[PDB]
Design an enzyme around this catalytic site. Structure first.
Site, PDB file in Angstrom:
ATOM      1  N   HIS A   1      78.675  56.557  69.646  1.00  0.00           N
ATOM      2  CA  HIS A   1      79.149  56.367  71.047  1.00  0.00           C
ATOM      3  C   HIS A   1      79.561  54.935  71.315  1.00  0.00           C
ATOM      4  O   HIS A   1      79.876  54.557  72.446  1.00  0.00           O
ATOM      5  CB  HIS A   1      78.164  56.962  72.066  1.00  0.00           C
ATOM      6  CG  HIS A   1      78.086  58.483  71.970  1.00  0.00           C
ATOM      7  ND1 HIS A   1      77.164  59.250  72.672  1.00  0.00           N
ATOM      8  CD2 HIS A   1      78.782  59.351  71.180  1.00  0.00           C
ATOM      9  CE1 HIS A   1      77.320  60.540  72.354  1.00  0.00           C
ATOM     10  NE2 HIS A   1      78.312  60.642  71.420  1.00  0.00           N
TER      11      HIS A   1
ATOM     12  N   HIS B   1      80.500  66.418  63.592  1.00  0.00           N
ATOM     13  CA  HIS B   1      80.136  67.835  63.739  1.00  0.00           C
ATOM     14  C   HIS B   1      80.236  68.625  62.435  1.00  0.00           C
ATOM     15  O   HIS B   1      79.479  69.616  62.328  1.00  0.00           O
ATOM     16  CB  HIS B   1      81.118  68.377  64.799  1.00  0.00           C
ATOM     17  CG  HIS B   1      80.733  68.062  66.200  1.00  0.00           C
ATOM     18  ND1 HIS B   1      81.112  68.845  67.293  1.00  0.00           N
ATOM     19  CD2 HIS B   1      80.014  67.023  66.711  1.00  0.00           C
ATOM     20  CE1 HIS B   1      80.610  68.299  68.411  1.00  0.00           C
ATOM     21  NE2 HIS B   1      79.949  67.201  68.091  1.00  0.00           N
TER      22      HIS B   1
HETATM   23  C1  HEM Z   1      72.181  63.506  71.131  1.00  0.00           C
HETATM   24  C2  HEM Z   1      73.184  63.486  70.265  1.00  0.00           C
HETATM   25  C3  HEM Z   1      74.600  63.590  70.720  1.00  0.00           C
HETATM   26  C4  HEM Z   1      75.146  64.149  71.859  1.00  0.00           C
HETATM   27  C5  HEM Z   1      74.454  65.018  72.903  1.00  0.00           C
HETATM   28  C6  HEM Z   1      76.538  63.926  71.843  1.00  0.00           C
HETATM   29  C7  HEM Z   1      77.454  64.389  72.839  1.00  0.00           C
HETATM   30  C8  HEM Z   1      78.822  64.184  72.832  1.00  0.00           C
HETATM   31  C9  HEM Z   1      79.716  64.774  73.764  1.00  0.00           C
HETATM   32  C10 HEM Z   1      79.339  65.802  74.831  1.00  0.00           C
HETATM   33  C11 HEM Z   1      80.942  64.288  73.509  1.00  0.00           C
HETATM   34  C12 HEM Z   1      82.288  64.600  74.180  1.00  0.00           C
HETATM   35  C13 HEM Z   1      83.142  65.701  73.565  1.00  0.00           C
HETATM   36  C14 HEM Z   1      84.459  65.656  74.398  1.00  0.00           C
HETATM   37  O1  HEM Z   1      84.503  65.980  75.631  1.00  0.00           O
HETATM   38  O2  HEM Z   1      85.520  65.196  73.836  1.00  0.00           O
HETATM   39  C15 HEM Z   1      80.809  63.418  72.401  1.00  0.00           C
HETATM   40  C16 HEM Z   1      81.766  62.577  71.897  1.00  0.00           C
HETATM   41  C17 HEM Z   1      81.647  61.780  70.730  1.00  0.00           C
HETATM   42  N1  HEM Z   1      80.570  61.665  69.962  1.00  0.00           N
HETATM   43 FE1  HEM Z   1      78.727  62.333  70.411  1.00  0.00          FE
HETATM   44  N2  HEM Z   1      76.821  63.085  70.862  1.00  0.00           N
HETATM   45  C18 HEM Z   1      75.713  62.922  70.081  1.00  0.00           C
HETATM   46  C19 HEM Z   1      75.649  62.247  68.878  1.00  0.00           C
HETATM   47  C20 HEM Z   1      76.758  61.727  68.178  1.00  0.00           C
HETATM   48  C21 HEM Z   1      76.654  61.190  66.845  1.00  0.00           C
HETATM   49  C22 HEM Z   1      75.439  61.235  65.975  1.00  0.00           C
HETATM   50  C23 HEM Z   1      77.910  60.706  66.511  1.00  0.00           C
HETATM   51  C24 HEM Z   1      78.387  59.991  65.306  1.00  0.00           C
HETATM   52  C25 HEM Z   1      77.656  59.110  64.625  1.00  0.00           C
HETATM   53  C26 HEM Z   1      78.766  60.971  67.689  1.00  0.00           C
HETATM   54  C27 HEM Z   1      80.080  60.520  67.843  1.00  0.00           C
HETATM   55  C28 HEM Z   1      80.902  60.807  68.947  1.00  0.00           C
HETATM   56  C29 HEM Z   1      82.271  60.289  69.066  1.00  0.00           C
HETATM   57  C30 HEM Z   1      82.966  59.317  68.193  1.00  0.00           C
HETATM   58  C31 HEM Z   1      82.743  60.881  70.178  1.00  0.00           C
HETATM   59  C32 HEM Z   1      84.049  60.630  70.834  1.00  0.00           C
HETATM   60  C33 HEM Z   1      85.190  61.637  70.550  1.00  0.00           C
HETATM   61  C34 HEM Z   1      86.579  61.239  70.981  1.00  0.00           C
HETATM   62  O3  HEM Z   1      86.883  59.968  71.127  1.00  0.00           O
HETATM   63  O4  HEM Z   1      87.419  62.194  71.144  1.00  0.00           O
HETATM   64  N3  HEM Z   1      77.975  61.496  68.724  1.00  0.00           N
HETATM   65  N4  HEM Z   1      79.453  63.279  72.045  1.00  0.00           N
END
Ligand code: HEM
Ligand code: HEM
Ligand code: NA
Ligand code: NA
Lengths: 713, 713
Positions: free
Chosen positions: A244, A77
Site C-alpha cells: 500500500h 493476489h
Molecule cells: C490485509 C491485507 C490486505 C487488504 C485487506 C488489502 C485490500 C486492498 C483493496 C481493497 C484494494 C483495492 C482494489 C481496487 O479497488 O482496485 C487493494 C489494492 C492494492 N493492494 Fe492491497 N490489501 C492487503 C494486502 C496487500 C498486500 C500484501 C499487497 C502487496 C504486497 C497489496 C498490494 C496492493 C496494491 C499495489 C494495490 C493497488 C492496486 C492498483 O494500484 O490498482 N495489498 N488492497
C-alpha cells in the site's frame, strides 16, 4: 442435463485424481518447461515489461500513467490464495487465469491486468509461463518504481485446467459469517483448511470483519488469515504497508454499475468481466472494490510515506462514493495526487485494515520500528515479497534462472548439498541384505519408509523423504509415526549406516535419508519374495540429511498426517468422512485412482497400519505381497455390518455360519462400495492378476519414494 | 464444497473431452483387449455360465430354480439404453456397472445379476470384459432354455468411468411428462436425442403412458422409442414377445418397502441396493418393478405360449400387490407355475405394453403372423436379439471370436472386402499430383474429405470415409455437404480414378473412398506449401466403395450433421447453444480440447466453411495453412459485439477507428471467451507456434481420416 453429482451429491468424487491428463495438455508429451525457460532471454522480457509499465492502453487507462500498482496487486493476489494447511492455492500453477479465481470478487479487474500482458506472452511463447510471468511482472513493477527486490526464480510450469480446491461451502459470493454454511464456529474459529474470511476474498474484508469498521477487530482477522498463509507479524506488517505504498483502490461510483464477473459475462466480452455502466467505465471512473483510497503522495515511487501518513494524522470514518467504509485524515491538506487530473489533489485516506497496523498493539510496535527505520522496512518487505511469491514452489532445486537468491531461507526446508560419491548398484544390494539380516521386519521397514516419504504434497511441493526429517522434531513425535517403534528402527538403521560408512574408501557414504528409503525397498522386495516373486525395487540415491537447525518445527506442523488412510489412521473424529480424506491424501500424493487402489491394498497386507490394527488386513499371509486384500474384500461369501460400539468400524462375517472373519473401516470398505473403485478392485482381485499387482505396487511405491526428487528432474 | 458448476451452471463443460485418459485406466497403456479375448477359452466360459444358471444363491434365490429370465433382462437392459440419434448408450462399454445406470429404477435388482457373475469375471480376468460378459450371459441363458441364438461377437472393451451422456433434464426419478423439465412437448413429441419416456426408464412405462393403462396409446410410445433405438415394427414385436416368453416380473408387496438404489446405499451394502423390508426381501417376496406378471406356462423354456395366451384370452384390468396396473386373463384356469411353491398356480397375466402387440393394428398383423408361423417368430427374434446386442459395435472388422455370424446384415453398414493390390507410395504421389493438376482447389479438396470423414462417431463406431458413402444417397444430398459443389469434385475425382485404374496392370486399382481421402491430403499439403512449409501428410490406403444397396438411407439420416462447428454450420435454430454442440461433435469424433482447437483454427483458414461463409475466416491468406485464426482472434485491438439482426453473429471492429475487421459466430468466439479454450488458443497464437500449429494440424487431420479404419487395428 442432470448429472451423477446432482443425483448423489455426497458420493465421493474421483475425477480430482484424473485431472491434468495428457488429453488436456496442448504441449507435446516431451515438452520440458525448465529447458524452455533456461533459454529465455529473461533480461529482454524484463525490458519489455518495463516499457509496458508506462504505455497506457485506452481500453483500461493507467492510473498516474503507470500500471505498477495494478501489477503488484495482480501478483499479490496470484500468490495470496495459498493455504499452509494443505499447500493448495498460491502462484505456482498460474490458476488466476482459470475459474473460479479469475472471477472472484477480490480479483476484479485483474482480468484487465492479465490482458495487458498478452503481447509479451505472445512474443516469448512457451519460454515463459503465465505463472512465472505474473510474478515477474510484479517484480518488474517494483523495480520500475525504485524498489530493489530480493530476487526471482522461474520454473512454475503452466497448467491447463482448474485445480480442485475446497474454497468453502457457501453458495453466495462474499456471504457474511454465520449463515447456513458458515466458515466460522466457536469464538471466531475459521475452519481448516480455509485461509480467508469470506467466499471470494484473498484474506480479509478491507472494511473490517463482516463489514464492521473496527481496526482492532480487523487486526485479529489479519493475523489469523496471514498465519494461515505462513506469514508472521513482521512479515504481515511489511507486506501490507509495502504493497500500500503503491497505487490506489477504485470506487468512483455505486457498485450496482458493475456487470457480470468473467465466467458469467457474454461471449463478446472475450474473457473479460466487470464491465461498468458508470461514466466511462474505466480510468478516472473505475470501480473495482468500491473503496476509493490513495495511500501516498507518490503512488508510482517507493517511499516511506505510508507510515508517515499512518502515524502523522488522526483518522475519521467516512464513505467512498460507492458507500464503503473507509478513513480520511483529519485536518489534512490536499497532498495526494489525482490519478488523471494534474490540477486536483486529495486528502490522505486509509482502509480499516491499514489502521490495524497502528491500533493493534503488537503491530504498532513493528510499524513504529519500520517508520523509524525505513531500511529495515525495505529489507523485510523484499524478503516477505520473495517468500510470498515463492512459498509454494518447493525445494530450491526447482528454482530457475539468473536471479535466484543465494541466501538459503529456513522456510524453504533446506537440504544440504551432497559432497561425496554416491552408492552404486552393488552397494545398494549389500545394504538391502544387511537391513534384512538385522532382524527388522517387512512391516517395520515398509511402515518407516512410508512415514518418511508420504509427507510430500504436490500442492506446494513440501515434504518427502529427502532430509531425513523423520528423525527430527516434530516428525519423530507424531502419533501416526509411532514414536517408540520409529526410534528403535532408526537406531538399528543408523548402526547399519555407521558400519557401512566406516568401511568405505574414497569418501563414499550413504545418508540416513537414502538408507531409510532403501530399507523400505528391501522390505517390499522381501515381501515379494515371501509371495514367490523375484523383483528388484528401483532405488535412486542422492538424498541428504538436514539438521534440526535447518528445520522449522512450527511450519512442519501442517505436514502432520492427521488422516492417513494408507495406514488406516485417523487422529480424531472429523466432520468429513474418512474416504473423502483418503482421496484428498491421494491427490496430495499425485496418485490416480488405480495407483491409490494398488498402493492401499498392498500396504494393508504388508503390515503398514498404525498400531498394528487388524482393520483391512484381509490376509492369512501378512508380510507377503499378494492381492489378498482385493480377493477377500470382493468375496460375496462375507457379509458386512457396522459394529454397535462404532458405526465407522465394520465386521465381516461368513454369510452362511456367522463366524467373524475380518474387521474394516470406511476406508477399507469403500473399495467394495463405490462403483468406480470397485471396478478397479476387481482388476486386482482377479485370478490372472497377482503378477500385475506386484508390478504395479512396486511402481507406485517407487513413485512415492521419489516425489520430492527434484534433483533428478 | 461449492464448485465451478455451482457458480456458473451454464458454462460449457470441457471435462467430457478428457474422460477416459490413461490416468483412470487400471490397464497398462499397451493393453490390447482384442488380443486378450482372442486367447480366451470361450467354450469354458460358456460351460461355467450354463452351470450358473441353476446354482441359486440364498441372498437372491433363483425364480423357478433358473436365473435365465433375470440374465435375459440384464442383457436386454445393457443394450437398451442405445439411442440412434447420437449412438450413445448401448451395451458396448459395459456402462450398466457405473453411475447413473447401475442405479436407474428400471435397472433395479440387476445389481444382483451382476454380482452373481463376479466369480466367472474373476476366474477369467482381463480376457473377458464385463461388457462382453453381460451379453454372453444373455446368450447362454437363451441357449440353456432351448433357444438357438444367431451368433455372438466379443470385442467390447471395458471402460473405467461413467460415460458423458445427456439422459434428460428432469430432477426427479421417473417424473411424468409436462413438468418443468419435460422431455415432451406438442403432440407427444419426445426431444432428441432421448429415447425413453421418463428419466430412469429403458424405453416405455410398463403400466402405460404416464401411468395410464391404455395399450393403444402405449403402442405409440413403444413404436417411437424402439425406432429411436433403430428397431422397426417386426423387430419390436419379435423382441418383446421373445423376451416375455421367459421369466417373470416382481411386485410381491408395496414399493415403500424398498430402500436406497446402489449409489445411495450405505457402505456396508458393498455395491448393492434396493434392500427390501417386505417379508424376506427376496425370492418369493421380491419387489423390483412393482408388477406381478408371469407370461407363460413354462417360464424357463422356449415356447410359443406368449402368443397363444395373448390371443387366446380376453384381458381384464387389475392391480398387482404393489398397486401397479396390469392385466389378468378373464375366466382362465390357474395354469402358470409359481416361482417357489410347487402347490400354487396362477392365471395368465400381461402388461399393458404386451397388450399393445395385439391392440395396435400394425402390431396385431405381425403378432398374428408370428402366432400362426412360429418358425418365423423364432428366426426374427434370433436376428433381432443379435442386432439389439451388437448395434453399437461398429464395423464387422471389430467382431471377435468363433461365434461371429457369416451373414452380412444391412445395419452393420457393410463395406466390401478388398480383393486387389493396393496403391503404394509411388502411386499415391502420382495420384496427388494429378489431383493438384486438375484445378481442384485447397478449399474443395479439404471440404470434401472433411465431409466424408467427419460422419464418424465413437459412440457406436458408425460413419467415416470408408465406403465412399458420401457419393450415395443420402449423404450426397445433405445441405452441409453442398450437393452441387460435392458433385463437381466427385466428377473430377472419378475421372482421375478411371484414368489411373485404366492404366494399371495386375488387378491394382484405387477405390473412390481412398481417393477422396488422398485428395484431401493433397489439399492440406498444398495449403502448407502456400504458407511456405514443406509437409507430407500421411495416408493409409485400403478403404473400399460400398453400394447404394448396402447403404440404408433411413439409418444414415441420423449421421446428418445438423450442427458442425468445424464448418461453421447450423441447419436450424436449436435450444442448445452452438458452442455446446461443437464440444458434443468433438466428443463423438474422439477429439480432446487441444485437438478440437487446432483442427477448427486450421479448417477456418483452409476454406472449409459451408457456403464459403466469411465468419471466422480471420486471415488475408485463405487456403494457406497458418495460425492466423488464433493470432487475429486474440488481438485486443479488436472489440466484438453481437449484431442487431442476429445476436448469434458478432462483428469485430478496430477499437481505435471503429472500422469492421471481421465477423464470427458463437463457435468462433468461444475460443476467445471460455477460459480454458482461450488458454489453448494462446499456445497456438504465440509467435513461436507456426510450426507447431502446422504439425499438430496434420496430426489431428490424419486422426480424423483414420477414425473408422478398424481393418488396420
Ligand atoms: C490485509 C491485507 C490486505 C487488504 C485487506 C488489502 C485490500 C486492498 C483493496 C481493497 C484494494 C483495492 C482494489 C481496487 O479497488 O482496485 C487493494 C489494492 C492494492 N493492494 Fe492491497 N490489501 C492487503 C494486502 C496487500 C498486500 C500484501 C499487497 C502487496 C504486497 C497489496 C498490494 C496492493 C496494491 C499495489 C494495490 C493497488 C492496486 C492498483 O494500484 O490498482 N495489498 N488492497
Ligand atoms: C416395451 C418393452 C418392454 C417393457 C415395457 C418391458 C417391461 C418389463 C418389466 C416391467 C419387467 C419386470 C421387471 C421386474 O419386476 O423384475 C420385465 C421383465 C423382463 N423382460 Fe421386459 N419389457 C420390455 C421389453 C423387453 C425385451 C425387448 C426383452 C428381451 C428381448 C425383455 C425381456 C424381459 C425378461 C426376460 C424379463 C423377466 C425378468 C426376470 O425373470 O427376472 N423385455 N420387462
Ligand atoms: Na499450491
Ligand atoms: Na454407444
Amino acid at each position: 442435463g442432470t448429472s451423477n453429482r446432482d443425483w448423489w451429491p455426497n458420493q465421493l468424487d474421483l475425477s480430482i485424481l484424473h485431472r491434468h491428463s495428457s488429453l488436456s495438455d496442448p504441449m507435446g508429451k516431451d515438452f520440458n518447461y525448465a529447458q524452455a525457460f533456461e533459454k529465455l532471454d529473461l533480461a529482454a522480457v524484463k525490458r519489455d515489461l518495463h516499457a509496458l509499465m508506462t504505455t497506457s492502453q485506452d481500453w483500461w487507462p493507467a492510473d498516474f500513467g503507470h500500471y505498477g500498482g495494478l501489477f503488484i496487486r495482480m501478483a499479490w493476489h496470484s500468490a495470496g490464495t495459498y493455504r499452509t494447511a494443505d499447500g493448495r492455492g498460491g502462484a505456482g500453477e498460474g490458476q488466476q487465469r482459470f475459474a473460479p479465481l479469475n472471477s472472484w470478487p477480490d480479483n476484479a479487474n485483474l482480468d484487465k491486468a492479465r490482458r495487458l500482458l498478452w503481447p509479451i506472452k505472445q512474443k516469448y511463447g512457451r519460454a515463459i509461463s503465465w505463472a512465472d510471468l505474473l510474478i515477474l511482472t510484479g517484480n518488474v513493477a517494483l523495480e520500475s518504481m525504485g524498489f530493489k527486490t530480493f530476487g526471482f526464480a522461474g520454473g512454475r510450469a503452466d497448467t491447463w485446467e482448474p485445480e480442485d480446491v475446497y474454497w468453502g461451502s457457501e453458495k453466495i459470493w462474499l456471504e457474511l459469517s454465520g449463515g447456513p454454511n458458515s466458515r466460522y464456529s466457536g469464538d471466531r474459529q475459521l475452519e481448516n483448511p480455509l485461509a480467508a474470511v469470506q467466499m471470494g476474498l484473498i484474506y480479509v474484508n478491507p472494511e473490517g470483519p463482516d463489514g464492521n469498521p473496527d481496526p482492532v477487530a480487523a487486526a485479529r482477522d489479519i493475523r489469523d488469515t496471514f498465519a494461515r498463509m505462513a506469514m508472521n507479524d513482521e512479515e504481515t506488517v511489511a507486506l501490507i504497508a509495502g504493497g500500500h505504498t503503491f497505487g490506489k483502490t477504485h470506487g468512483a461510483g455505486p457498485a450496482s454499475n458493475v456487470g457480470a464477473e468473467p465466467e458469467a459475462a457474454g461471449i463478446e466480452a472475450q474473457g473479460l468481466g466487470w464491465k461498468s455502466a458508470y461514466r466511462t467505465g474505466k480510468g478516472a471512473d473505475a470501480i473495482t472494490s468500491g473503496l476509493e483510497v490513495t495511500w501516498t503522495t507518490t503512488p508510482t515511487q517507493w517511499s516511506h510515506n505510508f507510515f508517515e501518513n499512518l502515524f502523522g494524522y488522526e483518522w475519521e470514518l467516512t464513505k467512498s462514493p460507492a458507500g464503503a467504509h473507509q478513513w480520511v485524515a483529519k485536518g489534512a491538506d490536499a497532498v495526494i495526487p489525482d490519478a488523471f487530473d494534474p490540477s486536483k489533489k486529495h486528502r490522505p485516506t486509509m482502509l480499516t485494515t491499514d489502521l490495524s497496523l497502528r491500533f493493534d498493539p503488537a503491530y504498532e510496535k513493528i510499524s513504529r520500528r519500520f517508520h523509524e527505520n525505513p531500511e529495515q522496512f525495505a529489507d523485510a518487505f523484499a524478503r516477505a515479497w520473495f517468500k510470498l511469491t515463492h512459498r509454494d514452489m518447493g525445494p530450491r532445486a526447482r528454482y530457475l534462472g539468473p536471479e535466484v537468491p543465494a541466501e538459503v531461507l529456513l522456510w524453504q526446508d533446506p537440504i544440504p548439498a551432497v559432497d561425496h560419491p554416491l552408492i552404486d548398484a552393488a552397494d545398494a544390494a549389500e545394504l538391502k541384505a544387511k537391513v534384512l539380516a538385522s532382524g527388522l521386519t517387512v512391516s517395520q521397514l515398509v511402515s518407516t519408509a512410508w512415514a518418511a516419504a508420504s509427507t510430500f504434497r504436490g500442492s506446494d511441493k513440501r515434504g518427502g523423504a529427502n532430509g531425513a526429517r523423520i528423525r527430527l522434531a516434530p516428525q519423530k513425535d507424531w502419533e501416526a509415526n509411532q514414536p517408540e517403534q520409529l526410534a528403535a528402527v532408526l537406531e538399528t538403521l543408523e548402526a547399519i549406516r555407521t558400519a557401512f560408512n566406516g568401511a568405505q574408501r574414497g569418501g563414499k557414504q550413504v545418508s540416513l535419508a537414502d538408507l531409510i528409503v532403501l530399507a523400505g525397498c528391501a522390505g517390499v522386495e522381501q515381501a515379494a519374495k515371501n509371495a514367490g516373486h523375484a523383483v528388484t525395487v528401483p532405488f535412486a540415491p542422492g538424498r541428504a540429511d538436514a539438521s534440526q537447525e535447518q528445520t522449522d518445527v512450527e511450519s512442519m506442523a501442517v505436514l502432520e498426517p492427521v488422516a492417513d488412510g494408507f495406514r488406516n489412521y485417523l487422529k480424531g473424529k472429523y466432520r468429513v468422512p474418512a474416504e473423502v480424506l483418503l482421496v484428498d491424501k491421494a491427490q496430495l500424493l499425485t496418485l490416480s485412482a488405480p495407483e491409490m487402489t494398488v498402493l492401499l491394498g498392498g500396504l494393508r497386507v504388508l503390515g503398514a497400519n498404525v498400531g498394528q490394527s487388524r482393520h483391512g488386513v484381509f490376509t492369512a499371509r501378512e508380510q507377503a505381497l499378494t492381492n489378498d486384500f482385493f480377493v477377500n474384500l470382493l468375496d460375496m461369501g462375507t457379509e458386512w455390518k457396522p459394529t454397535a460400539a462404532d458405526a465407522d468400524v465394520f465386521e465381516g462375517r461368513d454369510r452362511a455360519t456367522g463366524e467373524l472373519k475380518w474387521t474394516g473401516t470406511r476406508v477399507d470398505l469403500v473399495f467394495g462400495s463405490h462403483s468406480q473403485l470397485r471396478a478397479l478392485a476387481e482388476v486386482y482381485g482377479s485370478a490372472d492378476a497377482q503378477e500385475k499387482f506386484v508390478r504395479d505396487f512396486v511402481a507406485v511405491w517407487n513413485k512415492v519414494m521419489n516425489l520430492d526428487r527434484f534433483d533428478l528432474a
